[PDB]
């Protein structure tokens, strides 16, 4: 009767309530500063804002009814209190008996765990409201929200394989382009560190920027190991392309502003394959890139050139990319470590 995902959600939330349990209230009171009313206030105002945006219509999203949103919010508030208890009981400072007031007064966590729990609920129901709607109506920055996705996947083993597949989906959407928009808090994080971008060796071999760029680098290394297998290139060209992709992140970080991450990885691919004796054309490249799951055509057919005016991947390579990256590439007419 119910969908595999709607019935899995109902199993996790079964017997539980939209309120802290006696065990979580015993961890909230152990705290010099008890977080229970701050938590309930965050939840109240996230529920209000969700309901208001759910209840009213935009040119691209028709609004729907109070009753389906109050049910949708209630089941997400049950999942929140369950995943928060798992988080906090399994925390090192509970197993050592230390105060967890600081850990439980970080509002960005409570906001982004309620938001993830609302997207779990919405996707299980195949909602017309597709990510990034919840974090956009909840005023939540992609650069701060993605960090709870790993926490939810680790803290609820009842999550279906489709729900995990989706959560890893939206986490890569953030590491691809929603955290690189011009109004992203990532550029703030860069600013307070003198705009020095971490290199792969600094994060791979504890830092908002460190754990962002270590997920970025890991994701880009996966998408590169596929491209280099389906175009049969040398492992040392892979080492060289990867060094130019690092160069464009560290020394030309503005190239990612309001852009996609595979746009700078494909141009790193063509420019280093062309500088060496292993020339593969953008045509040969997009034929193999096409088969990658994140590849929609707009990645190589609607690239931002200046701002607005949009072109395609070849014209972005010729008008913007080669001017700022030829210096480095022409040195191959020290390579960075490639990880797993």
């Amino acid at each position: 009767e119910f969908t595999q995902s709607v019935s899995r959600l109902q199993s996790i939330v079964a017997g539980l309530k939209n309120a802290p349990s006696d065990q979580l209230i015993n961890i909230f009171e152990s705290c010099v500063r008890n977080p229970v009313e701050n938590i309930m206030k965050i939840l109240k105002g996230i529920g209000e804002t969700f309901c208001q945006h759910y209840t009213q219509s935009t040119d691209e999203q028709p609004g729907s009814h109070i009753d389906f949103a109050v049910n949708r919010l209630k089941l997400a508030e049950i999942l929140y209190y369950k995943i928060l208890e798992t988080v906090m009981v399994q925390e090192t400072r509970r197993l050592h008996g230390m105060d967890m007031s600081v850990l439980l007064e970080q509002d960005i966590f409570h906001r982004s765990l309620m938001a993830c729990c609302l997207e779990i609920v919405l996707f299980a129901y195949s909602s017309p409201r597709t990510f990034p709607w919840i974090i956009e109506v909840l005023n939540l920055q992609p650069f701060y929200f993605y960090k709870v996705i790993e926490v939810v996947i680790r803290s609820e083993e009842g999550l279906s394989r489709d729900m995990v597949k989706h959560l890893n989906s939206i986490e890569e959407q953030i590491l691809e382009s929603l955290a690189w928009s011009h109004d992203s808090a990532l550029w703030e994080a860069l600013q307070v560190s003198a705009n020095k971008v971490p290199t792969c060796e600094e994060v791979i071999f504890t830092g908002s920027l460190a754990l962002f760029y270590r997920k970025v680098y890991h994701l880009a290394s996966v998408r590169l190991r596929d491209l280099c297998l389906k175009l049969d290139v040398s492992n040392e060209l892979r080492r060289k392309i990867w060094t130019c992709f690092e160069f464009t992140l560290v020394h030309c970080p503005d190239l990612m502003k309001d852009r996609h991450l595979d746009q700078l990885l494909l141009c790193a691919f063509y420019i280093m394959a062309k500088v060496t004796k292993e020339e593969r054309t953008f045509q040969e490249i997009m034929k193999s890139y096409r088969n990658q799951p994140q590849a929609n055509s707009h990645v190589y057919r609607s690239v931002l050139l200046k701002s607005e005016e949009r072109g395609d991947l070849i014209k972005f390579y010729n008008t913007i990319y080669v001017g700022r990256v030829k210096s480095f590439a022409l040195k191959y007419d020290p390579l960075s470590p490639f990880p797993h």
């Binding site: 063509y270 420019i271 062309k274 953008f282 045509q283 096409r290 395609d312 991947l313 070849i314 080669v322």
Partner: peptide, 11 residues
């Protein structure tokens, strides 16, 4: 290191 391709239509 200019690309001399015109379009990326052909697969």
């Amino acid at each position: 290191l200019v690309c001399h391709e015109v379009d990326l239509d052909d697969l």
